[PDB]
C-alpha cells in the first residue's frame, strides 16, 4: 500500500532497514527519476524527505526461475567499500512482485571515469589506479571472508565518488556463497572479465575468479581498453592465450580436468612489459602478472594484493589527492578483514596509522 | 549471465 | 557444451594465429 501524496510529489512506503532485526519504518521520498533501465528492472534516484540525502532505488523483478540471493547477501554486508543498503521494500508486470533496494547514491563509476580518459586520449593517473584497485581488493577481502563470491566484477560495478575518491562495490545479483563440494553455474561473470576456468566450463570454481576479474580491471585502467575482448568464450580464451601463452597440462588440469587430453597448439607468451605502454610502472606490471594466472590457486588473495608493493604510495603519510584533499580511510582493517592472514597487518597498517 | 536455475 | 566440440573450435582458432 504505497501512499503517494503531494508536499512536490511525495512517495511513502513501509520499508525494512538493511541491518539488524526486521523493524520496518515509514520512509518518505521525492524527486524520483530514472538514472538507469534494463531488462532486469528499473533504477531510480530519489531524495529522502527527512534527511534530504540522495539515494538510489534499484527495482528488480522477482524472477522465480533463478536463484535470487541479492537481498539476503546485501543484508549481511557492512563495509566502507561496498555500497550501503539503507532499506528494502516490495511493490507492484501486473500481478507480479518487485523488490526495491534503497542504496546510498554514488554519482560515478570506474567505467565512466575510464571512458573520459579514453576519448581524451589520456591515461588515468597512476595514483587513481592505485586508489581504485586497492579499495576494490579491500571489498573483495571482506566479502571473501564470508565465503561470498561476487561473480560479476567489472568497471561498471565499481561506484566512485570522484570528489573523495571513494570506491564502492555494487551489484550483488550474481553473488553467491561458494561451498566446496557443491557445483555452481559456469556461465557466470560478464564478457571480458570471465576467468579462464569459467570459459572452460568449470562448475567447481572458487572466489579466485573475482581476483582474475580484478586483474582485468587493473589491466584495462593501464591500457585504456579491455585486455581480453571477444564476443564468445573462444574469442576471449584466444586473447588470453595470446598474452599468457598456451596453458600447460597441469594448468589446464587446475582449471578443468576434462580438457587435459587435447593437443592445443603451443602459442608463446607475450611479455607483460610489451603488453602495456613503456611508461607503465614496473610494480603495476608485477601485480597484474600475479593476478592474471591460469592456476586459480596461484593468484594473489585480495588481502595479499593490498599488501603488494604497487600500493606503497598509499601507505605514505604525506600522500594526497590531486584535488588537494586527503586520501580516504584506507587502514581501518577489522579482525574479519584480516581473518585470512592476520600477520599481514604489519604491512597493511603503517606506523602513522597506528595512532 | 543469470545465476543458477532452481 | 561438449569439451570435444569446444576444444575443436579452440584448436582451429589457435592454429590460425600460430606463428
Ligand atoms: N547505489 C547507486 N548509486 C548510483 N548509481 C548506481 C547505484 N547502484 C547502481 N547504480 C548504477 O545503475 C547501474 C546498474 O546497477 P546494478 O546494480 O549493477 O544493476 P544490474 O544488476 O542490472 O547490472 C550501475 O552500473 C550503476 O551505474
Ligand atoms: Cl606463437
Ligand atoms: Mg551491474
Ligand atoms: Mg546484477
Author numbering:
A (entry chain A): 25 to 31, 35 to 119, 122 to 384
B (entry chain C): 1604 to 1609
C (entry chain B): 383 to 401
Question: Which sentences from the paper describe this structure?
Answer:
Glycogen synthase kinase-3 (GSK-3) is a highly conserved kinase that in higher animals functions in insulin signaling, microtubule regulation, inflammatory pathways, and developmental programs including Hedgehog, Notch and Wnt signaling. GSK-3 differs from most kinases in that it is constitutively active and controlled by inhibition, rather than by specific activation conferred by phosphorylation of the activation loop. GSK-3 prefers pre-phosphorylated substrates, termed ‘primed’ substrates, with a phosphorylated serine or threonine residue at the position 4 residues C-terminal (P+4) to the serine or threonine to be phosphorylated (P+0). Here we show that the auto-inhibitory pS9 peptide sequence and the inhibitory LRP6 c- and e-motifs all bind to GSK-3 as pseudo-substrates.
